[PDB]
């Protein structure tokens, strides 16, 4: 019937997200990669103090895939709150390391940021994230920054999920391997 799920401890932002969700899905309360994209490219793009051009489709797709457990290609409502919380959080740290608004963050400035974002990577992972996300120069704009961190955190959770006993190790067949690596 009329949309339910009532918390009484709503918020400004979220509920507008929530209203958007229903206006596009409703009781389904699910959004796609493109629908999401639009939903993020406003509460992140509208700020005259954050230099970014918005999230790329691939970013949203990775946003949708990592929070999607059934592989339906749709981001849930509740899974959005986890992510957007993390996003409204990494945006924070972002502008700390980009206080001269240029739409990207200085090459050797990024470590402080990752160390700050709650991710202290080792030699090679830092190499991995640069190769993969650093643009041309070796700098990084908010889009890759957020995506990287979304995909990163989710690969910590993924590991810990397949490592219940706690061996800091994990065994996967090829089915799983591919699903884990293709759906991220």
């Amino acid at each position: 019937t009329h949309y339910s799920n009532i918390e009484a401890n709503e918020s400004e932002e979220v509920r507008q997200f929530r209203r958007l969700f229903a206006q596009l899905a409703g009781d389904d309360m699910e959004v796609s990669a493109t629908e999401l994209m639009n939903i993020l490219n406003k509460v992140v793009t509208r700020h005259p103090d954050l230099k970014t051009d918005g999230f790329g489709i691939d970013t949203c797709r990775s946003m949708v895939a990592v929070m999607d457990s059934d592989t339906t290609g749709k981001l849930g409502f509740e899974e959005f709150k986890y992510l957007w919380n993390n996003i409204k959080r990494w945006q924070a740290i972002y502008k700390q390391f980009d206080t001269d608004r240029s739409g990207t963050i200085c090459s050797s400035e990024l470590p402080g940021a990752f160390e700050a974002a709650g991710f202290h990577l080792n030699e090679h992972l830092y190499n991995m994230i640069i190769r993969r996300y650093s643009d041309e120069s070796g700098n990084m704009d908010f889009d890759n920054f957020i995506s990287c961190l979304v995909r990163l955190d989710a690969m910590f959770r993924a590991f810990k999920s397949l490592d219940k006993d706690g061996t800091g190790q994990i065994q996967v067949n090829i089915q799983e391997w591919l699903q884990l690596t293709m759906y991220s």
Partner: protein
């Protein structure tokens, strides 16, 4: 969230979670833990997942603005009766009744559990009381689409004026049916979620069994045997009477009621009456009261009419709900459903025959596995596929050729849209075809369009209905068959469970493609490339032959797409960074000359493959055409993997353009070589520490 969660869960299920023994724990609540906790603090459980608020009752129909749920107090049994008994011994009759807000169907399913002590103890753990370690918490087991979920609940019950509003025992001091109902209300989300419900639905939810129903004004010409094989199989058979527009008549020597009161079929014997042979059906009124002229009508004193005490002493033995009317009973009773219990249902008691069970699980996903009906042959062959194998046929003497009987039930899982039960149901059905031979597709091949095209079905789906489970009892000769579960129309996402009750063993597999990958054996070199790419390439490389992923892009865009942006012209950087990772065996981030011509060539083998499919200078490929595009590309995969590809690179218009088709194939070829290399001994698995997983998890 994410497959590492579902894979993790799939492992658990495989190890035993969701099984009656390891029932899944709803909302991570622990009955013992929570009870222990309250046991300790000397307090009572107040469920945090099911508040004694209006939302538990409903959403303004049994909801918060509405009078129905106004001024009513949630009382526990402690207050309701003097010696609150949860349950009681053998309990002859059954005096359970609805409240001014309950539902008729409810009492039917719940009452049906009192017919068997063993089958009630399965939904409602008997180890519960209000005397020893009360704390105010009870638990129950509900079977949810192929799996058992344990549910916790506090004994707070909705009462207005001080009486139970929902199900309750009229006499007694027993409250297990009250709390069994609140529990079922909780796992459905709302007490008002139970409305619209069907007893066939509650049977299976309270059983694990498969309930097949039959309209009695047009039953099977083999319904008696049907009734007999079930009765000797401990099945819970339930017949009812219809209430059609104030329908309360006699219809023949048959009494005067036409009330919709649920009865059970506990007996069915065929007896020789003066040489005639009478098929009798023993009914039992779950509440007790008899009220049925005769004993068995038709010149009734037929217990002396050539019917020896050698069978007369058998009848009229029991107590409570003692009827035995003639099968011609069809006059009255408008309906009948039997829950055909699963193997473990009976505590291994050799008492009743047992069904053979083999359930599966599947998904339907838009642009991949959402095939549709046999009505849409373009996409049909894309639904998951299975194998039914029959060898040992049924046992009775002789009746209608063939042999092997199998009761197939296909059920659809829920998906944040069904506010109640019975609603927002997809129209589901399934088709059965017989294996013409295939020892290749015996389990390791996925049947394409061509097979269902040259292959008729047999009895298959009788029509795609719009309900929770669609049934179909069969009896096909001893062989091998393929079941293709689906909805009617394509693109209808959904999960499902396809079980199988056969009187005899039946090998049931999940016929699909193995994860295969086989393409180029590009043995390197410098020569033979013919100084062709050599010349103009080396020219593009600043110095030796290295070209980074950012260089690869601009370079590859000058070639393809002719240069007019729109519909992704050239190759996105993720694609390019992917095309580098696939050949950069060191970490330079740039590509040499051998591992560049490789890219150039393998790419040429992608355009040809994209257009050989997308006949139209539109630069747009449909989804369903991927399984086949990944085919002539070296890779094959099971349904899951096809689902993620489409869910990762497809458009909302179910389209995957060339760029996403290329990163997809390159991203995909890379991981195969990573696993294959980590696994030379071909053990089928790979070990990895977090760091390793991190080096790898970031493409």
């Amino acid at each position: 969230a994410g497959i590492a969660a579902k894979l993790a869960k799939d492992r658990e299920a495989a190890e035993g979670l969701g099984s009656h023994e390891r029932a899944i724990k709803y909302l991570n609540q622990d009955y013992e833990a929570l009870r222990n906790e309250c046991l300790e603090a000397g307090t009572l459980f107040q469920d945090p997942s099911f508040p004694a608020i209006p939302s538990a009752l409903g959403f303004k129909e049994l909801g918060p603005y509405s009078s129905k749920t106004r001024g009513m107090r949630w009382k526990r049994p402690t207050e309701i009766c003097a010696d609150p008994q949860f349950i009681i011994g053998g309990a002859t009759r059954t005096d359970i009744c609805q409240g001014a807000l309950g539902d008729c169907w409810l009492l039917a399913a719940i009452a049906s559990l009192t017919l068997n002590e063993e089958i009630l103890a399965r939904v409602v753990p008997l180890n519960q009381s209000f005397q020893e370690n009360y704390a105010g918490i009870f638990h129950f087991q509900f079977w949810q689409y192929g799996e058992w979920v344990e549910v916790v609940v506090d004994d707070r019950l909705p009462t207005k004026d001080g009486e139970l509003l929902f199900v309750h025992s009229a006499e007694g001091s027993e409250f297990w049916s009250a709390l069994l109902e609140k529990a079922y209300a909780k796992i459905n989300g709302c007490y008002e979620a139970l409305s619209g419900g069907a007893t066939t639905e509650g049977f299976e939810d309270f059983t694990g069994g498969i309930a097949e129903w039959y309209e009695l004004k047009k039953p099977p010409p083999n319904l008696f045997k049907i009734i007999q094989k079930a009765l000797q199989k401990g099945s819970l058979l339930g017949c009812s009477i219809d209430i059609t527009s104030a329908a309360d008549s006699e219809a023949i020597t048959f009494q005067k009621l036409v009330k919709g009161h649920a009865y059970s079929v506990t007996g069915a014997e065929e007896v020789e009456s003066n040489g005639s042979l009478q098929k009798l059906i023993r009914i039992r009124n779950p509440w007790g009261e008899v009220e049925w002229t005769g004993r068995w009508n038709d010149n009734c004193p037929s217990w002396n009419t050539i019917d020896p005490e050698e069978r007369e002493r058998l009848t009229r033995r029991h107590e409570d709900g003692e009827f035995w009317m003639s099968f011609s009973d069809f006059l009255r009773h408008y309906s009948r459903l039997e829950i055909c219990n699963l193997t473990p249902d009976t505590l291994t008691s050799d008492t009743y025959k047992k069904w053979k069970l083999t359930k599966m699980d599947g998904n339907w996903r838009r642009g991949s596995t959402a095939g549709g009906c046999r009505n849409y042959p373009n996409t049909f062959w894309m639904n998951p596929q299975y194998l039914i194998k029959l060898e040992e046929e049924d046992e009775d003497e002789e009746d209608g050729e063939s042999g092997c009987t199998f009761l197939v039930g296909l059920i659809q899982k829920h998906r944040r849209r069904q506010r109640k039960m019975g609603e927002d149901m997809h129209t589901i059905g399934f088709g059965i075809y017989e294996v013409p031979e295939e020892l290749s597709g015996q389990t390791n091949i996925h049947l394409s369009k061509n097979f269902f095209l040259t292959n008729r079905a047999r009895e298959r789906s009788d029509t795609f209905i719009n309900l929770r489970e669609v049934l179909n009892r069969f009896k096909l000769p001893p062989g091998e068959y393929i079941l293709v579960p689906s909805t009617f129309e394509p693109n209808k996402d959904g999960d499902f469970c396809i079980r199988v009750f056969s009187e005899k063993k039946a090998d049931y597999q999940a016929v699909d493609d193995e994860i295969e990958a086989n393409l180029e054996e590009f043995d390197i070199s410098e020569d033979d490339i013919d100084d062709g790419v050599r010349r103009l390439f080396a020219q593009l490389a600043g110095e030796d032959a290295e070209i980074s992923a950012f260089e690869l892009q601009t370079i590859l865009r000058r070639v393809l797409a002719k240069r007019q942006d729109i519909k992704s012209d050239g190759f996105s950087i993720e694609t390019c960074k992917i095309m580098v990772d696939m050949l950069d065996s060191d970490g330079s981030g740039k590509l040499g000359l051998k591992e560049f011509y490789i890219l150039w060539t393998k790419i040429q083998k992608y355009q040809k493959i994209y257009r050989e499919i997308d006949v139209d200078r539109s630069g747009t490929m449909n989804s369903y055409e991927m399984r086949k595009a990944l085919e002539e590309a070296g890779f094959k995969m099971p349904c899951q993997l096809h689902q993620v590809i489409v869910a990762r690179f497809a458009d909302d218009q179910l389209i995957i353009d060339f760029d996403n088709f290329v990163r997809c194939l390159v991203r995909l070829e890379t991981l195969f070589k990573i696993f294959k290399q980590l696994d030379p001994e071909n053990t089928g698995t790979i070990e990895l520490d977090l760091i390793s997983w991190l080096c790898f998890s970031v493409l």
